[PDB]
């Protein structure tokens with residue numbers, strides 16, 4: 171109708187249509203760019219960023235312990251006994267801790283001088299936590315003293331010098347902003363799972379988790395490393411072989427350890443990591459591993475006549491069904507996909523991991539006929555049963 | 565030995581250990597944050613960023629056509645007939661096009677005034693393309709004239725006014741930097757696949773692709789939209805039902821269209837989108853869809869006695885085996901995971917999509933017993949065959 175008609179022509183698209191966000195404004199306006207979502211997944215990312223920085227001190231050899239506490243007030247506190255965040259004035263004229271807390275693309279991980287091998291690389295993590303917290307407190311033990319700083323809705327207060335101490339390290343306590351997050355209710359089992367991974371990947375490290383909100387205490391320390399991680403993955407799954415396969419390899423700027431064992435189950439349990447970061451969606455290290463494994467198993471099965479010349483090749487899916495594996499890459503110059511680091515991008519890590527897996531898995535299969543035969547049996551007998559059922563579909 | 569021993573104690577960790585990168589320096593130093601990798605996946609991301617901006621003009625209703633050309637020199641040229649990038653001086657004192665090409669977190673998509681619904685939201689895309697190109701040229705048709713700008717290793721030259729024209733729009737041509745990328749060899753089929761998706765999702769839009777490097781020409785225009793996308797997905801897969809299921813729903817700040825059809829094959833072919841962006845790793849819209857579908861099929865199968873009361877429930881995997889589906893969400897305030905936008909994060913979109921799918925799929929199953937029975941048969945007979953084979957494993 172005439173009455174319904176409105177003056178609703180679109181606004182002019184000009185220079186003033188283009189807005190520039192300040193750094194921390196960009197985190198608050200577009201948190202998904204940095205943490206994926208403002209749901210449970212993104213809330214936990216705040217813990218990951220702070221714990222990753224403590225783990226980076228451990229990987230450098232300075233930290234031996236990470237203490238994580240979820241306080242009754244919903245704040246998270248992460249303590250390490252590493253070198254401490256510098257508090258001396260930065261060239262920019264603020265305390266160095268204020269630089270990292272308030273500036274994007276600021277940090278000590280843009281070269282290999284401070285951390286040779288680190289999960290950190292963007293200079294963003296702790297600034298995101300500050301941006302998306304109503305409050306952040308830091309206690310740094312350095313240069314013979316305690317140092318205290320706080321951030322009030324991301325804005326620094328005045329650095330305060332405390333008492334004398336010979337200890338060094340960093341404590342970060344943050345209050346996730348309820349105006350950003352749909353929930354601030356951390357999941358203890360989610361946090362325990364990730365801290366357990368970090369301990370399995372760093373067999374010298376101890377991590378302690380305490381939840382004071384009204385199991386509330388775990389200690390994570392696994393001197394048996396990736397082999398014990400696979401034992402843990404297979405604990406509910408019934409191993410179909412007595413051995414855990416474990417090997418490593420080294421190239422210019424990169425190393426890999428792989429542990430793996432097949433079970434009686436129908437799930438793929440392949441966990442991939444770079445510099446302790448959980449690359450949930452995989453990437454070049456997982457692709458190299460998968461390529462090698464499918465090649466070695468098919469070559470072995472055909473050589474040993476376990477696969478008929480007629481029979482189609484075993485697929486990656488056929489082979490990885492019932493596989494538990496951990497792939498841990500150490501890389502001087504990681505390429506991660508985004509701040510959530512879901513994938514390793516390094517093109518050179520694909521051929522490196524593929525090469526080491528090809529060599530080590532070919533050797534293992536050749537040297538272990540009884541176990542190799544059971545694994546090939548599993549992969550075949552499954553594929554064969556799946557096809558016979560599919561052909562009986564009416 | 566004594567001779568092997570070196571003065572290799574680590575450098576002091578102080579204020580000068582902390583470096584701040586300029587914006588485009590951060591893209592060149594850490595391209596993975598923005599494009600995932602410097603391999604083939606990241607190279608193609610440069611095309612995606614430029615084409616997404618043209619698609620955003622089409623979604624706003626200003627552009628009708630996107631022309632993509634891969635030149636013999638390895639440059640990519642993207643033309644749209646939208647409003648043009650503003651060239652007038654920005655408040656910051658440079659031409660507005662220079663602001664978007666040189667500054668991170670700068671753009672017209674931080675509110676809904678310029679673009680109501682856009683894949684763009686970070687103000688980063690075109691600055692990444694510039695940062696990772698040795699050269700970028702822009703031709704803007706606006707205000708009665710052609711305007712020309714170039715960027716030389718990301719640095720703007722002087723904006724030049726050209727001839728008169730009543731036309732409006734934007735052409736971007738960029739030369740991917742071979743010092744950043746392991747390969748600059750674009751894959752025609754990779755580009756064709758993505759442009760085809762954009763056309764299926766925007767049934768009024770025409771996209772043309774030309775490859776002049778020494779099939780070299782495609783036109784993408786699909787007035788049949790998501791229904792014709794599903795027809796295309798199932799073309800090699802043998803539909804097991806005569807219908808394509810197609811429905812939509814609307815809520816405050818969001819809409820969804822879903823088209824789906826089951827086939828005789830053993831693959832899941834579910835493609836999910838938000839504001840035309842391909843959310844390859846899914847997210848809240850895919851989770852809502854999956855939850856609804858598993859609920860509706862199990863409820864239907866039990867109500868109709870197609871599943872014995874004894875029988876275990878059909879799993880999501882059982883149900884989605886042989887499923888072709890397209891989920892297209894339109895959202896005023898998208899939350900994407902990272903600049904590669906692999907996942908939709910919006911918590912409210914999960915319950916929205918789940919609600920619409922629950923209502924529309926329950927209705928479709930009830931109204932279409934012959935097709936519903938065949939789909940349940942497929943899901944059961946498969947699961948049943950898979951289990952019988954697994955139990956015959958020795």
Ligand SMILES: Nc1ncnc2c1ncn2[C@@H]1O[C@H](COP(=O)(O)OP(=O)(O)NP(=O)(O)O)[C@@H](O)[C@H]1O
Pocket residue numbers: 219222223224227250252253254255256270276277278279284289290291292293294295296297340582
């Ligand atoms: N627990 C810590 N101990 C010592 N130094 C730390 C600690 N946490 C942060 N830092 C320093 O602060 C810098 C900034 O940290 P952060 O913002 O998390 O970025 P990053 O770790 O360098 N990279 P990323 O985490 O990938 O964004 C680090 O590079 C260190 O130099």
Ligand SMILES: Nc1ncnc2c1ncn2[C@@H]1O[C@H](COP(=O)(O)OP(=O)(O)NP(=O)(O)O)[C@@H](O)[C@H]1O
Pocket residue numbers: 188613616617618621644646647648649650664670671672673678683684685686687688689690691734
């Ligand atoms: N083809 C185009 N036509 C008109 N305006 C454009 C075009 N390309 C870019 N722009 C403008 O330039 C701004 C910056 O673009 P870009 O750097 O890609 O960021 P964005 O599209 O806003 N967000 P994102 O792509 O998610 O980083 C856009 O928001 C528009 O205002």
Ligand SMILES: [K+]
Pocket residue numbers: 269270271273274275276277293294295296297
């Ligand atoms: K920082």
Ligand SMILES: [K+]
Pocket residue numbers: 663664665667668669670671687688689690691
């Ligand atoms: K921009």
Ligand SMILES: [Mg+2]
Pocket residue numbers: 219222223290291294295296
């Ligand atoms: Mg960090």
Ligand SMILES: [Mg+2]
Pocket residue numbers: 613616617684685688689690
């Ligand atoms: Mg864009």
Ligand code: NA
Pocket residue numbers: 175176177178179
């Ligand atoms: Na009107």
Ligand code: NA
Pocket residue numbers: 278279280281282285286288291502
């Ligand atoms: Na580094």
Ligand code: NA
Pocket residue numbers: 232233251252253254337338339
């Ligand atoms: Na210390």
Ligand code: NA
Pocket residue numbers: 569570571572573
């Ligand atoms: Na030495």
Ligand code: NA
Pocket residue numbers: 672673674675676679680682685896
């Ligand atoms: Na917007």
Ligand code: NA
Pocket residue numbers: 626627645646647648731732733
């Ligand atoms: Na136009």
